[PDB]
Design a protein around this nucleic acid. Structure first.
Lengths: 100, 76
DNA sequence: TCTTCACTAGCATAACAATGAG
DNA sequence: ACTCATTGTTATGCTAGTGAAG
């Protein structure tokens, strides 16, 4: 609609993206690699850095935003999966050792 | 001033080089660091895993603590 | 086709984390 | 107040490659 509101929304999103990638333990290179794997288009560390630095074309920022949203969804899913699985293994091993 | 967070190598290297200096003083950190890069290259994923998870936790806590950090070098 | 102009995704590589003796 | 090594994560100088308007 206007460049002001869009850039505001985007800059806040970029912050949020960084936040999530750190809390999930992906390097910049890692995000590039995984985006590459699940959408079949390679992304360099460089472009990810540029994204997180809001140093990309508004078009490119908004072009990547959907891709990152899907990525974040998939990343967060995998995190929850692993977390649940790990605690499951914990309970398991614990009980087992205990009785044995 | 906020210093940049340490990677997995740096974590493990920090652990090692203290014991190595206690063990054998008057060894310079140059020999030490060559030795430790050499050693680290030889570890398996299994072996690396806790230091990787530790460095992840450190980066997380660093961002949590200093939300508005940005790595700002001094380029040649 | 050749010349500037201006962007552009990526390739390289330096900067800086820890440590403390030269 | 340096230099010194090390690996790995980040920023970015520097492209070779790509058109647009003269």
């Amino acid at each position: 609609m206007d460049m002001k509101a869009l850039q505001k929304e985007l800059e806040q999103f970029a912050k949020l993206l960084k936040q999530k990638r750190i809390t999930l333990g992906y390097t910049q290179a890692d995000v590039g690699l995984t985006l590459g794997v699940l959408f079949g288009k390679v992304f360099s560390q460089t472009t990810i850095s540029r994204f997180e630095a809001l140093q990309l074309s508004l078009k490119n920022m908004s072009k990547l935003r959907p891709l990152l949203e899907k990525w974040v969804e998939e990343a967060d899913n995998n995190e929850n999966l692993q977390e649940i699985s790990k605690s499951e293994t914990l309970v398991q091993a614990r009980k087992r050792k205990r009785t044995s | 001033r906020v210093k940049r967070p340490m990677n997995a190598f740096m974590v493990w290297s920090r652990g090692q080089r203290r014991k190595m200096a206690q063990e054998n003083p008057k060894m310079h950190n140059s020999e030490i660091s060559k030795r430790l890069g050499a050693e680290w290259k030889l570890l398996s994923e299994t072996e690396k895993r806790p230091f990787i998870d530790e460095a992840k936790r450190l980066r997380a806590l660093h961002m949590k603590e200093h939300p508005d950090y940005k790595y700002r070098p001094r380029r040649k």
